[PDB]
Q: What sequence folds into this?
């Protein structure tokens, strides 16, 4: 019954989650590298916060679409 | 180095902790998808999955916050 | 005489049996109103069966305990 | 529900009967001679088994 919401199956959505989760973790990983300016570092954190929110929201959307 | 200074924990250890929380949230959602429950019991399993995921998400976000400030 | 044999009054055992009977009946009813499926349906159904057996055996023990 | 044509409500009526008759049978032993008492016990056991089997068949038909 999950398939009804958008036409996609669970497996369709697992590929999106993987994608989104990987990009957020990659963005956080950047802040472990040395060399950036304070301004650059600030922006990278914001980007990591933004991308994690998207990935987490997608996970919670999948959970809620189960009923 | 800076992370361990700020938190008292190593990135490696916190990554392992987060991984355990991630897996437990994921296993709870998988149990819901597998569940023949309905009504209040489905709800409770669903709320449990939500709560565990939030615990895992908040840990990731604290780790991100602890990269400098 | 029932009290001499069992240590319990008939009235007390009737109330004990009534509780076991109601819980058995509530569980079967829960299965009927539930929209459960699969293993969770099988489990609730097994639970209802198990509680009924407990209520049924209590009734049968009270019957056995009526003597002379 | 489709298994005999009767509804749950039809079967509830039967269960009430069987349970009531078995309970009345057991109650007769709360009032006979030796083997006459044993007879009433065997009847009580027989009728309880019928009522229990009927409850379990209603559960299994759900």
A:
């Amino acid at each position: 019954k999950y398939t009804r919401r958008t036409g996609r199956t669970w497996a369709d959505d697992q590929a999106t989650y993987n994608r989104l989760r990987e990009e957020a973790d990659a963005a956080r990983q950047k802040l472990r590298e040395s060399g950036y300016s304070g301004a650059e570092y600030d922006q990278l954190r914001q980007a990591a916060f933004d991308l994690n929110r998207k990935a987490n929201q997608y996970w919670e959307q999948m959970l809620s679409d189960l009923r």
Observations:
- The CA atoms of residues 1 and 11 of chain C lie 13 Å apart.
- Helices of chain C lie at 2-6, 10-33, 38-64.
